[PDB]
């Protein structure tokens, strides 16, 4: 991403081993950057 | 806004996986409070060992400012 | 057991056991004394079952007790029958538990890798267990011999 | 986990022993109590909600615990507490069916003491919630099953203290 | 002299001298470092009965008691 | 010297305490049991020597090389000192029987046993075999609680030597 | 001519006169084959003969469990003792071992040295036991191990310094603190040194040494891992100058083990108001 | 320390009660069987050395790895420690048998023992086995002794077994 | 908890030693003595109710002033806590009878007695007089070795309080 | 493990002291002595096979009866475990030679020796006689200070067993 959405503090949390890759992925799933771009425009069935 | 900071050891006991896996089984991870009840059950239903837990983030008091 | 397998389903859905789950525990436990008799008979004839299994095996495939064979020699043979004694034991465990949980963790998960490493023909080995079933099936009266036979055929099934 | 039938097998397997007379006697001692365990589980399961309600009423609510400053103040925490209660009841029912407490260690007690210390959850108050559910259970299940159900509630409660 | 500074009470101020001769008890050979069985302890008055009790308890023989402070 | 009486007194003294009902009950055991003990004692006392000559010989019969020349079961002095030694053991067994405890055995034979036997090249095996034999024959001189007592102390010596 | 219940009878067709299974039971015989292998010798099976000097799998090499825990210089500890008519270097070696053991590896500065007791210990007017008692009642021991700790830490530090072993049960601690409250610290220190465990082992001239890592007679088996918790390394000490000055170890949750029954079943449930009728 | 009476007393006291006629007669029966109990304890004491020795011979017969270099009963120092532990456990089992209660065994011997052995690298399964062998031989002796009056000692043989089995379970 | 059994075991353990004939003789005393002990126990157990009311009253009859207002034998709570306390003593006496030693008395009443009584202004004299009375009446409930046992333990409490 | 080096270091450490000329002089002894020690070690090492078979046999020749049935020099397993045991001794002798002290002998054979031998019914006499024989033959494999070293350690084992 052109230095976009990304993960300020998210990157340090994943590296540092404060957070584990599964966890980081879960954070990424529920975020504005994600809601917009994949759930912003779709009935309830293809977004699932 | 409350994050526990658990630590576990889960030992694979159904498959003898063949590559890597060190960090898969002995690891420290803050997991948010909303999900920590399930993560603990999942560690326990795999014969895992929950070595440590902490509050880490939240105050250990409550009512306002907890369930955000 | 049936209990271990089933309760696990209860706890995982955060609930008490179902009428169904309770019923099967009841039917299972009613079939207890018979299963215990099947294990006793076979425990009582273990040495006969193993050796006669071992003869039946080496006829059907001798090469293993020959110059370039994995079981060639007196102490390389003392180990092959010992492995046959191991699996008969696990079969008695399985029969009294009513499923394979114990049989599986103790002697199939990791095996095939285990046998393979040592370079033993896995089908050679399943003959031998299949041969043990025959000797043993014959020291039991017709009803108990079948009940025992299911556990022998399980091991034969798993090793492949 | 392990149960009475399974424990007998793994306890002997590590010694490489056939099941012998002593083993066979233990397994009989389990099978002979089996039908009674099943009936008791069906009573507990079908009265689950009433047992929690009566146990909370005798040992938790109408108190400082449910008042501001108390750990089961807020609908959130009241819900979490009786949720916990249901776990205990449900797992004790598993332990009693299995005739082995090992599941109570593997899936309930491990780390729970410190989890409760970390959140501030009152341990002594939780034990009373366990021993009140036992009291109710022992009435509902009858002479046949009372002692056998009771022990796994007692296992749970000395596991926290 | 003795052990020196004692307890501050007057009943701690009086130290006495005991010459003993400990005997081999029974039951066992001592192969460790042994000492010649005579010796002497200076004990304050406040302590004295435990010390004489454990001296005569281990087969000992109290040979002399002396008033060294008082 | 260890007896029921000395033991309870030792335990009282060490807590600075008068004898109480616990300690007097104990003493009654020792006194109630004197009759059986002392019957064993009288029987072992009058039927005595031959036990020594029997056991001495058996040491040579079980270790033949013993009674051969250059060996430690040869010549009057070895064979004399052997009889004497078994006699010492039987003597202390009777004392332990009469005393109500192992004291006489502990103080006069057990304390120091191995050091002595090791310096003098005396094998415990002989002494165990002397005692095993004495135990065989005492089977028909006594019975009931006198035999149990005799056995208790013979076995105590055999364990001291193993 | 007797009972019905010989009804256990096999029902096959019995063998004919030369079947291959009449001489079957004699066919297992006296050769070197699959029927020659002794059955009960299957468990104690080895390599291709691997004879007797193959090492064991997972070798250990004696004094490595000591090396693993780092208790090598301490299990077993060497015995230091004041011989009669000792020279100066002997007395300095004894004094150094006393200051290492009794003061728990914490350091004494040159101003803190109890000098005028040593002029006498060199005289021979006191023994090593009396010198240990005099140190343990002085302010060097009192400021470090008593003045900033609770009674549990102080009582367990007395066992480590004076007796060289760990507390055995809760009864040892509940006996000693009763003596402390009844009779003060001076009788309390004397209770360890006038005990039977000191007089039997250390006598009158032997500097107290570490005994909690080997087996001692009349011990509880919790006495070893408690001593491992008390040990803290060869370059460790029971100093207070850290961030937690003498927090307790071997907590009375160790000394009494499992619990069985009780929680106080208290009622913060509420009761009161009264109206009457209609039901 | 508890014995079987002391145990009764502690449970009674926790009720605030004089001993129940139930508990009284259970203890009257223990007094009834006490001569047999004394013979049973005496059977072990009188053969302690052989019980340990025979257990030992058989343990190393089975587990020839322990007496190889690398093994936990090698060299002489370690074998002496292992022989010593066999004696210690047999000793506390005999104490429990005189007492009619396992507590002295659990409190003075078994408490912490497993964690000691693991710290040391001592194979607990081998130690458990050595305890199983001591049990076989010890009971052998309890059942077939020198001119004891003939009767039934199976209740006591069971109870002795549970003390051996406690120790084994606790350690493995 | 001090009994003949625990004492001999303690003494063996502390010398790293199997139980020997000395220690088993001791145990036989305790077992032989159980019958008399347990008869005393049963008699004291069923008469407890009245033994307690008898002794409670006797404390007031010997110390009349206690029952006047402003005093410690006045009001339901003092008189209730008194009955209870004598009942505690009789209870531990029966326990000591059944146990074969003073342990129950030592651990539950003697350890700490004076400190407690001194903080709470409880005079031992009352308790001695309660026990002296209980001793008078137990003269006709028992005889022979059961009476001697009952006496042993009652007297043990009286000495603990002097 | 006791060597000249470890001993001087232990003595320094225990006085909180750097190694001084006293301790370094000592170390030079151990280093100067290594040549003779290590020659003994190499000779004992390559002859091990036969030194062991020689001593094993000599145990049977001096104690003929050992090789009869029912005895402890009979059957493959006893005779195998014997060779092994003498081999252990020679092994630790070479180690002690190479190490510059008795440490290896003290830690691996001496500590515990008697307890083990006593539980297993192993007579020291055999082992002394094995070692006396090994000492006879080592007379012609070595000479001068290598022989003195070999002797020092063989004799050390014989004294450990007496
Ligand atoms: C949202 C709140 C939050 C904070 C504040 C935060 C800090 C933080 N700083 C980090 C590293 C770092 N922080 C610095 C900071 C500095 N270097 C200097 O010399 C200066 C003194 C200072 C800047 C003024 C540096 C250089 C690293 C990299 C260390 C490395 O190379 O691993 C890391 C490790 C992961 C990573 O490298 O990103 C974290 C998590 N993380 C968070 O989640
Ligand atoms: C990529 C680097 C890496 C390594 C090295 C690694 C080791 C490793 N070994 C494991 C278990 C294990 N490791 C062993 C090993 C042995 N058993 C013995 O007795 C022998 C002494 C030894 C073989 C020589 C065994 C038996 C287990 C299973 C333990 C269990 O049953 O849970 C586990 C637990 C998860 C699993 O069971 O797979 C890990 C992660 N993991 C990694 O990611
Ligand atoms: C601030 C967040 C919060 C709330 C709201 C709360 C409610 C609450 N309501 C309760 C009982 C109750 N609440 C009611 C209420 C009603 N009965 C009816 O039929 C009506 C529908 C309703 C009145 C409008 C009744 C009747 C009980 C008694 C129920 C029982 O005792 O079984 C109790 C248990 C008694 C106690 O221990 O206090 C709690 C904790 N607790 C909290 O922490
Ligand atoms: C499957 C086995 C299992 C158990 C037993 C379990 C317990 C458990 N109880 C929790 C919290 C809690 N537990 C309670 C319990 C109580 N409150 C009281 O005052 C009473 C004394 C008591 C009820 C009787 C409360 C109030 C919380 C919420 C604490 C918070 O606000 O964070 C949490 C934190 C995560 C969450 O809030 O869900 C866990 C994991 N988790 C599990 O996985
Ligand atoms: C500094 C080095 C040192 C020496 C030299 C020493 C001698 C010494 N020998 C003693 C006893 C003894 N010494 C002997 C020696 C003998 N009995 C005889 O008949 C023979 C003539 C002689 C042997 C040749 C005996 C028998 C006793 C015990 C006396 C008794 O307790 O009755 C004792 C009394 C303590 C004990 O018994 O352990 C000491 C201190 N102690 C030491 O620490
Ligand atoms: C108070 C208790 C007590 C005991 C038990 C005792 C044993 C004892 N046996 C000894 C010698 C001896 N013991 C024996 C024993 C035997 N010779 C044989 O023919 C048989 C093989 C065997 C008898 C079974 C022999 C031959 C000697 C002489 C050893 C010597 O001086 O070379 C000696 C050396 C002093 C001496 O020469 O008399 C002692 C102290 N001494 C005691 O004071
Ligand atoms: C209870 C308090 C107490 C006193 C009073 C005491 C005196 C005392 N002075 C001593 C030595 C000494 N005292 C002196 C004193 C002197 N030399 C001279 O020429 C002067 C006349 C005089 C100084 C004014 C000397 C030189 C020695 C050493 C003697 C030697 O070792 O050769 C010693 C021998 C032990 C040692 O040297 O430390 C004692 C016990 N010790 C005590 O514990
Ligand atoms: C540093 C100064 C210091 C303190 C403060 C201290 C506390 C302390 N209290 C203890 C026991 C105790 N403390 C109590 C106190 C109480 N019981 C109750 O029910 C009440 C709520 C409370 C009185 C108000 C009791 C009953 C015990 C004995 C517990 C037992 O052994 O079962 C113990 C265990 C050792 C012993 O019993 O002597 C310690 C160390 N020790 C110290 O050295
Ligand atoms: C086994 C051999 C051994 C070692 C190595 C040892 C280390 C050690 N250093 C200590 C303290 C100390 N160590 C230092 C050292 C330093 N301060 C600094 O700022 C520098 C960075 C550094 C010097 C280079 C200081 C200042 C203390 C005192 C800390 C305090 O009390 O506040 C203490 C606490 C006890 C005491 O103060 O005597 C130990 C045990 N003790 C031992 O027995
Ligand atoms: C409370 C009574 C009590 C017990 C039970 C006890 C156990 C115990 N066993 C120990 C060692 C030991 N225990 C053994 C035992 C064995 N080795 C094997 O291979 C076999 C499987 C087994 C014999 C059956 C060995 C070999 C050691 C020495 C370990 C080492 O130092 O490497 C140690 C370490 C201290 C020492 O070596 O003396 C303790 C404390 N200590 C006690 O005070
Ligand atoms: C010195 C301590 C001491 C001991 C040891 C002791 C033993 C003792 N065992 C006895 C009985 C007995 N002892 C046994 C024991 C056995 N029966 C068997 O067949 C088994 C092999 C063995 C099992 C342990 C039996 C069956 C009786 C007879 C029944 C009875 O009196 O209870 C009797 C009653 C008298 C008799 O019938 O001989 C005594 C006094 N008394 C004591 O004061
Ligand atoms: C387990 C054994 C045990 C004993 C023996 C025991 C004695 C005992 N008696 C007490 C009080 C008492 N004891 C009495 C005794 C009497 N009042 C009278 O009318 C008579 C003069 C007399 C009976 C002879 C009284 C009046 C109190 C109340 C004292 C107070 O709190 O002011 C208390 C203070 C706690 C309380 O108030 O209950 C103790 C601990 N407690 C124990 O746990
Ligand atoms: C590291 C140093 C070390 C030594 C020295 C050692 C000695 C030793 N010898 C043993 C057995 C043995 N030792 C022998 C010895 C002999 N048999 C004969 O034919 C001859 C008479 C004699 C040789 C001179 C025998 C026969 C056994 C078997 C004893 C048994 O188990 O019954 C055992 C018992 C364990 C086992 O059975 O292997 C030990 C520990 N172990 C060690 O770890």
Tab-separated table of N, CA and C and ligand atoms in Angstrom, chain I residues 59-60 66 72-73 78-79 81-82 84-85 88-89 92 108-109 116 120 122 126-127, ligand 12:
chain	number	residue	atom	x	y	z
I	59	UNK	N	-18.821	-24.692	89.678
I	59	UNK	CA	-18.058	-23.468	89.591
I	59	UNK	C	-18.803	-22.312	90.280
I	60	UNK	N	-20.121	-22.203	90.100
I	60	UNK	CA	-20.877	-21.139	90.787
I	60	UNK	C	-21.070	-21.408	92.279
I	66	UNK	N	-19.467	-15.188	91.578
I	66	UNK	CA	-19.489	-15.180	90.117
I	66	UNK	C	-20.889	-14.905	89.524
I	72	UNK	N	-18.603	-12.435	86.026
I	72	UNK	CA	-18.386	-13.248	84.832
I	72	UNK	C	-19.123	-14.576	84.808
I	73	UNK	N	-19.876	-14.869	85.864
I	73	UNK	CA	-20.843	-15.971	85.846
I	73	UNK	C	-22.283	-15.480	85.756
I	78	UNK	N	-22.172	-15.566	79.307
I	78	UNK	CA	-21.096	-16.090	80.154
I	78	UNK	C	-21.387	-17.539	80.547
I	79	UNK	N	-22.543	-17.758	81.160
I	79	UNK	CA	-22.957	-19.108	81.544
I	79	UNK	C	-23.034	-20.072	80.341
I	81	UNK	N	-21.023	-19.761	77.611
I	81	UNK	CA	-19.651	-19.988	77.144
I	81	UNK	C	-18.876	-20.855	78.106
I	82	UNK	N	-19.367	-20.918	79.336
I	82	UNK	CA	-18.776	-21.756	80.355
I	82	UNK	C	-19.088	-23.222	80.096
I	84	UNK	N	-19.908	-24.545	77.439
I	84	UNK	CA	-19.188	-24.885	76.222
I	84	UNK	C	-17.736	-25.254	76.519
I	85	UNK	N	-17.074	-24.423	77.316
I	85	UNK	CA	-15.683	-24.649	77.625
I	85	UNK	C	-15.426	-25.935	78.387
I	88	UNK	N	-15.751	-28.554	75.950
I	88	UNK	CA	-14.516	-28.727	75.186
I	88	UNK	C	-13.549	-29.633	75.941
I	89	UNK	N	-13.343	-29.389	77.239
I	89	UNK	CA	-12.407	-30.214	78.003
I	89	UNK	C	-12.819	-31.668	78.020
I	92	UNK	N	-12.051	-33.324	74.723
I	92	UNK	CA	-10.684	-33.663	74.430
I	92	UNK	C	-10.152	-34.766	75.314
I	108	UNK	N	-4.891	-28.955	71.374
I	108	UNK	CA	-6.095	-28.161	71.269
I	108	UNK	C	-6.467	-27.392	72.529
I	109	UNK	N	-5.941	-27.769	73.691
I	109	UNK	CA	-6.232	-27.022	74.918
I	109	UNK	C	-4.985	-26.515	75.653
I	116	UNK	N	-4.350	-17.207	76.569
I	116	UNK	CA	-5.741	-16.969	76.310
I	116	UNK	C	-6.449	-16.616	77.611
I	120	UNK	N	-8.347	-12.904	78.569
I	120	UNK	CA	-9.791	-12.920	78.727
I	120	UNK	C	-10.276	-12.888	80.182
I	122	UNK	N	-9.963	-15.134	82.577
I	122	UNK	CA	-10.480	-16.424	83.007
I	122	UNK	C	-9.542	-17.060	84.025
I	126	UNK	N	-11.452	-21.847	88.423
I	126	UNK	CA	-12.762	-22.313	88.041
I	126	UNK	C	-12.612	-23.650	87.354
I	127	UNK	N	-11.725	-23.678	86.359
I	127	UNK	CA	-11.584	-24.840	85.502
I	127	UNK	C	-11.086	-26.040	86.278
K	12	LIG	C1	-10.671	-25.855	71.820
K	12	LIG	C2	-10.497	-25.619	73.291
K	12	LIG	C3	-10.892	-24.213	73.665
K	12	LIG	C4	-11.077	-23.688	75.028
K	12	LIG	C5	-10.891	-24.466	76.299
K	12	LIG	C6	-11.474	-22.264	74.836
K	12	LIG	C7	-11.670	-21.292	75.947
K	12	LIG	C8	-12.136	-19.888	75.728
K	12	LIG	N1	-13.036	-19.341	76.585
K	12	LIG	C9	-13.331	-18.118	76.091
K	12	LIG	C10	-14.278	-17.186	76.736
K	12	LIG	C11	-15.048	-17.336	77.995
K	12	LIG	N2	-14.904	-18.336	78.885
K	12	LIG	C12	-15.774	-18.083	79.896
K	12	LIG	C13	-15.803	-19.050	81.035
K	12	LIG	C14	-16.650	-19.057	82.096
K	12	LIG	N3	-17.656	-18.207	82.366
K	12	LIG	C15	-18.392	-18.578	83.428
K	12	LIG	O1	-19.551	-18.302	83.716
K	12	LIG	C16	-17.559	-19.541	84.210
K	12	LIG	C17	-16.921	-18.715	85.321
K	12	LIG	C18	-16.524	-20.059	83.212
K	12	LIG	C19	-16.683	-21.527	82.902
K	12	LIG	C20	-16.070	-22.297	84.052
K	12	LIG	C21	-16.448	-16.761	79.760
K	12	LIG	C22	-17.448	-16.052	80.619
K	12	LIG	C23	-15.970	-16.283	78.461
K	12	LIG	C24	-16.310	-15.001	77.775
K	12	LIG	C25	-15.090	-14.097	77.974
K	12	LIG	C26	-15.235	-12.805	77.218
K	12	LIG	O2	-15.215	-12.769	75.957
K	12	LIG	O3	-15.382	-11.805	77.934
K	12	LIG	C27	-12.617	-17.797	74.832
K	12	LIG	C28	-12.656	-16.518	74.015
K	12	LIG	C29	-13.376	-16.574	72.697
K	12	LIG	C30	-14.793	-16.591	73.095
K	12	LIG	O4	-15.278	-15.554	73.614
K	12	LIG	O5	-15.379	-17.665	72.907
K	12	LIG	C31	-11.778	-18.992	74.602
K	12	LIG	C32	-10.841	-19.205	73.455
K	12	LIG	N4	-11.544	-21.926	73.549
K	12	LIG	C33	-11.228	-23.025	72.851
K	12	LIG	O6	-11.198	-23.025	71.564
